[PDB]
Amino acid sequence: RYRTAWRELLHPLPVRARKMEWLKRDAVEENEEILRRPYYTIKSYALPPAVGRQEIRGGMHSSHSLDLIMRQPRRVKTPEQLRALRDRLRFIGVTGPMPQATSVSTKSYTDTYGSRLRPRYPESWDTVPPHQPSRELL
Amino acid sequence: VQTGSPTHQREYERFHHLPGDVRTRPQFDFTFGETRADRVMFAWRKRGDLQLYQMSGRGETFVCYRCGYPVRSQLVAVKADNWDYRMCYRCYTNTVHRGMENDT
Amino acid sequence: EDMPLYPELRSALRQLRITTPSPIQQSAVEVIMQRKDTVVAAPHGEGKTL
Amino acid sequence: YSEARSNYDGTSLPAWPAPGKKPTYPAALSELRLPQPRMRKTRTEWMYYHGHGGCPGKYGPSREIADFEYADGTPASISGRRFAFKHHQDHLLVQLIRAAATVERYDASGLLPRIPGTAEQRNWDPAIPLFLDGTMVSHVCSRVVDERMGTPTHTPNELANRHEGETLEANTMFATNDPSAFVS
Amino acid sequence: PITWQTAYPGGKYRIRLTDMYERDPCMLMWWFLKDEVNRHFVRKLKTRIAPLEKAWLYEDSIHPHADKNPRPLCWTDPEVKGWKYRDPQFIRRWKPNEFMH
Amino acid sequence: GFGGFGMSVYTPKKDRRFRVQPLP
Amino acid sequence: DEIQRRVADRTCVQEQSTREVQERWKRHVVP
Amino acid sequence: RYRLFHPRREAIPMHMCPAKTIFPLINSNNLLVKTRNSWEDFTGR
Amino acid sequence: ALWGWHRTEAKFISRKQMISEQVQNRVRSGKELVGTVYQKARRQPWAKYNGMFPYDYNGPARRPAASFVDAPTPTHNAEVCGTAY
Amino acid sequence: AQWVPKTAWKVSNLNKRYGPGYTLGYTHMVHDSHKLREKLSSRKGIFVIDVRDPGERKLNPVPRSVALHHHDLLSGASCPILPQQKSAAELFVLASNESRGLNSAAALRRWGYDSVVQVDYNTLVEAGYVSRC
Amino acid sequence: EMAPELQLEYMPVLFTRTILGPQGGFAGEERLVKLEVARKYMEAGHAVTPTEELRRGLWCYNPDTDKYDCFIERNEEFLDFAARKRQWLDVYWRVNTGYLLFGRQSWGQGFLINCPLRKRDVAQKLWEQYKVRIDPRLIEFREKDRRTGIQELGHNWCWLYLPGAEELGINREVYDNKRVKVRIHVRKMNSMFALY
Amino acid sequence: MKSVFDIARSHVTFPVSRDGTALRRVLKDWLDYTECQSLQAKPAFPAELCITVHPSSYTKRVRLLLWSAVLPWEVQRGLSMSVLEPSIIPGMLFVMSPESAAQGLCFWSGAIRQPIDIAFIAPVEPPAADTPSFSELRQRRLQLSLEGYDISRFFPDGELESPTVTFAVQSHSYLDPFPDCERRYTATPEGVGRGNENVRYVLETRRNLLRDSIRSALRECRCTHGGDVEVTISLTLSDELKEDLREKARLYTNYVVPLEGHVRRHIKCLSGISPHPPIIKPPLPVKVGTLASTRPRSPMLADEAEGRPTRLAPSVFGRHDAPALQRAQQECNQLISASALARIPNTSPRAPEIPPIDYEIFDLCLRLGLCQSEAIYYFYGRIMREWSKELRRLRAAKSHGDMVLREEDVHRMLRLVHDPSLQVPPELSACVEAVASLRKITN
Amino acid sequence: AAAIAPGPYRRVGNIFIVHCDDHPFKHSWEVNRMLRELRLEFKGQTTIVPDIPQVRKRIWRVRHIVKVDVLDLDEAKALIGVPEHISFTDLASQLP
Ligand SMILES: Nc1ncnc2c1ncn2[C@@H]1O[C@H](COP(=O)(O)OP(=O)(O)OP(=O)(O)O)[C@@H](O)[C@H]1O
Ligand SMILES: [Zn+2]
């Protein structure tokens, strides 16, 4: 077995380096398998989001707290409820007027204390407030 | 390279980084007993018409008849026991890989 | 015959008593028919004009 | 006193099971899509699993929890590095938000093709099934890098002369539909 | 091989392990201890010589160090390793409830 | 790794730091 | 069993009566 | 071994910086942004 | 441990070789009757090869041992076993 | 008795002179429309995927079927929409071109749905699944 | 359905003798062939103008008699069989004509490669630069490479087994209808194309 | 009464290699034995099912008459269209190949009359015998064995001759008959013995046989639990059953393999496959080399000489112009440019002649498991295409307002489709049903 | 259960979390340009990008220097404490 003996004789990298090279090729193949996935995925409302998943077993992974929520069923089960939540959803920092015909006695904080003024915030290691509201714009 | 004493690192393990016959155990051991006149310490298996030898001391510069360059090394490949035609280890490994050890 | 030529051009080669493309005629003819800017360079008498 | 904090709200899964019931154990083998070779989780993978950034002070509690509190309870003060880390968290958040919003805009416009991948990926991967129906220096550099990245190898001129405008036809005579031959 | 150099020209002594053993068996153990020590302490003569004197080599089994009461040090070599073997086949023990349901 | 032909031979300092034991 | 099979195959000069009587006594005593 | 195999989601943990930090009222229905734009607008300690 | 002269006449051998000895003891029972000086001087191992095989460097080949998981638990494991006779 | 594997019948697709696709043996668009009504009144669900042009499915608006594209079905973006029970569930592909029908069937086979039958809009009208008017 | 300006460069051509190539076809096939190559075919005698009588029936070259004595009637099953045979012959010609190119990393100037190739990589590069889709099960390495695959640097060759030979009857003109020899040249390339 | 050995002794005389009618008669007689004879008429042999009870031993022996099924048709048939019962209990034994036991064993309830209980048994050795030394002993004795049955497929561990080997059960399941021929219809080993190479024996018997046996065995178990008791099952094959299994395996390996070769040759024949001063020097066959010439120049060069063409390369014998080269080409009937030599193959444009399809052999192969995959791969596409063309013809006649297909062939294919013992692809099933409905042909 | 899920259907895209694992400055200028477009400068940096064909092409070009993880829109809505009745277009329009 002269040919294979000579091949086994000469090698550019040691066994550990060859192991790392095989791990590199495995990472590349994983990248390619990940890229081969489709762009979007048609899902339904009522069914849980983790029903169409394509996929070291029997143990708990780092994404356990996330796959629990993915396996539990969805909350908003109909576009009716979706829009019934959206029409009540409101923005604050939106540029422009906001509806006030609900209650006349209430005044927004912007109208009450101007725009250049903010409430003093408790500044500590635990919670940080935004600084320089003048620089906050553009 | 030299990274230890001959008790642990043999002399033929210096060229362990180079690919070819050096990564195997030599057959002849002239290091014990009387010392050779040319200070050869090892000799590998005679492949066809070529046989490898490892010198001692600083590398004796010779001229490889295959590449034509002056080569300073401890490894020398003698052709058919004729010590006028020598080969550097690089040309020796390439000659074997091509299978020209019997022809060249 | 391996290069594509029109039959009326074939008669022009026979009238000029041409029978085989010279080295510069072998590598330059196929390039010009691809509509590419070419610098046909060769020594004198190698049949550059044709 | 002390702070035992793992997430923002200090909540965690029940760490101790019911008395007498079997406890749950994490995965010891690394997250590898192949069964071979079976490799034990290294300490850096263990840190990444437990939530750190692979270093003791890169993320997690060791970096988010304060270091000193006054005896009367008064908290610490804001530091430049604290503000920078908060801005880094907000930067990651806004990156994710803008990526998701760009995906949603592309989906609403229709710029997400039903065919997965790209032209290069489809010409390179056989496992992909066949589908059958200002300044100018930046632009020219993008064109050059596209021309140098795309088409890594070319069909030999003996099969099809690319200069003559000849391109071979795709053939699926010996191909198989099951992906087992490519996944095994 | 075990080789060393003397002050005389061409004094490259080269002896076999067999030769050193037939000369003195303790010399081999002392040489290997010197190597294992110089692996980490070679800079300071103190740090490379002082440890060696704490080894008490003895060719035969008898030794005068019975008063110090040497404890029989136990050590495990890093070579012990169980290569994977074929899973042995044995009969399965069933259960009445398993056969019922 | 192990350098080939073209790469020049460089002799590095011997690692003299204390090493842990290779447990089985 | 292995040694008797090997010795029978390598000898090839014997009588099956001795091998048969023992298996017959086995059939008579064991089951 | 420097060739680690783990979901790179673990490299950026989000357990410590949920949406309640970027939008303090996102748990409720009203939506408001309270973010730190950059590192230069720092009033100080 | 050696029982005879050379290292090939080992006191402990494999079961294949042992079965070979057992079958030879019956197939060639005739040659055991006579001890001739020819065989006596042939038995001298002064000309037999003594070279280091690959297992002389890599150790004896690793093989699994007979497991006894099916053995019942020792009920008298604390008691000390006595001598044979 | 021993179960002969279903994949053992896929070796005929390897026949070069007589292959499924490279004079046609689809036999799915020509099935008898009688059993369609029985399978309908037994199942009574959504198991018909229509893969055709938007203009065509607007001209023939089958209400109970689910509209999809064959490229999408081959990419697999509709896995959670698929019945998720590859063994028990059976699908009906409503396609105009036999080519598109066979391509959708091949995509469903690749995703693991072996029980897929093609059906034409005319056959559906004659059976009564669409209930045209 | 081609554009008129594009169709101006092509001409309908009926093939008399089976020709392999991107502008070829099988005996009794109608195709839009470019002007230069179509004129070359018609001058060599391998092509004919697609008249209605010729679309009905054609004469073809016989390899055994070396003459155009084989009258053929263009039918649907004949067209299908001849298209399949042309596909088989084109796959064989593509895999047996030129080299396959592999470019990988190898630290130093050694003779073996850092990461040996496999049937998956061979099929990948085959589909990439030959436009031929095959499964890795048909790729059988040499006796020395059955262990670790293609590992040397420079030139190698592998066996590729084609099943559909005796059904279509190709064993005459082909060298070996059982298998084919793919010559693969492995080299060191820059980082972006080596990728390993 | 009738025996496979008598069948083979009768078929001894039939010349298979000379006449295809003889092979067809052999296959017809085999189908007759397989489907026209009763399981009670087929011979059986006794065996004892032992049950040992480990408390924390009690032995329970049961008389079992086991029908041995080793042949491929018998294995694919099983207990289909047969009844077990028209002190001793009937049963059936199946022996799987090692290659098939490597994959997941899957049994199905096909056209059975009574519900069946299936137990996956396998040979096991004591741990004192499972040492690798005795493994090598058995391997050597089997490679030296002179018996007819193939060692690689039949008994690769030697469980018929070893005294210490015991046939023990590893998984238990049940098969229920379909409502049409008289709740799970599929059986697969689970738990211990799942996906193993040694689990190669299947015992089918009356439903709840093990349940009744354990009920009869657990007599002292009530008081043992009243004042944690395990159970173990093993099987002992009598000497007559051992001899029957050995002789059936030998008859298989010495009869069906030539029969399979002849069936494959016949299928190839039915498909049309038959075994087999000049200016330009054309290719010539290579010259046979002597010892020194075929010896390479180097042992490393000894590998390059593996792949070498048997023909030399063409050449020219001078320097000539283009017209001279073209005239030499047309005179010597040889092209010079390798590109043209590769692009222009000398191929016969005509299609290969094929005799008509043989539905009888297509049905025989499926019903007897002989070269099933080859018969499918060679005839399924042709049958589908012809039946679809006939369906198109019939639908055209219907839309408007002699035939190629034979009525006997249509009846045979309808039998093949409506036979519950076999599984036909839905494509072929629906195609045959539609063609029969259009042609007004039933049964 | 063996029937197709009824009701209205919604599209769900993906996002890529890309982490660089090898020194980019060691490679050529083109791969460095692609990684710069992907917003990666040094070894050990992680970014978040959409699943658009441009980003897919960039990651396919630099697939040997970075490792990518996929997160659908619902998976992101679970990973970050945002309710399901709030999309991401509004969040992007609200952030300054
Ligand atoms: N293929 C051919 N075979 C034989 N003769 C040829 C061929 N081609 C050209 N010639 C002859 O070669 C002669 C010179 O050709 P041409 O004028 O192209 O040379 P040239 O390189 O242009 O010379 P200069 O550079 O001096 O102008 C012509 O008279 C022509 O007859
Ligand atoms: Zn040289």
TrEMBL record, chain A:
Composition bias, Polar residues: 100-113
**Which region ranges are annotated with the description Disordered?**
100-138
Superkingdom of source: Eukaryota
Q: What is this protein called?
A: Uncharacterized protein
What organism is the protein native to? Trypanosoma brucei gambiense (strain MHOM/CI/86/DAL972)
Q: Which residues of the full protein are shown?
A: 51 to 195 of 195
From TrEMBL, chain F:
Q: Output the superkingdom of the source species.
A: Eukaryota
Identify this protein by name: Uncharacterized protein
Q: Species name for this entry?
A: Trypanosoma brucei brucei (strain 927/4 GUTat10.1)
Shown portion of the complete protein runs from 40 to 63 of 189
TrEMBL record, chain J:
Gene Ontology cellular-component terms for this entry are:
cytoplasm; kinetoplast; mitochondrion
What InterPro entries does this protein map onto? Rhodanese-like_dom_sf (IPR036873)
Q: Which domain of life is it from?
A: Eukaryota
The protein's name is Rhodanese domain-containing protein
TrEMBL record, chain M:
**Origin superkingdom:** Eukaryota
Identification of the protein by name: Ribosomal protein L30 ferredoxin-like fold domain-containing protein
| Organism expressing this protein natively | Trypanosoma brucei gambiense (strain MHOM/CI/86/DAL972)
Shown segment, full-protein numbering: 51 to 146 of 218
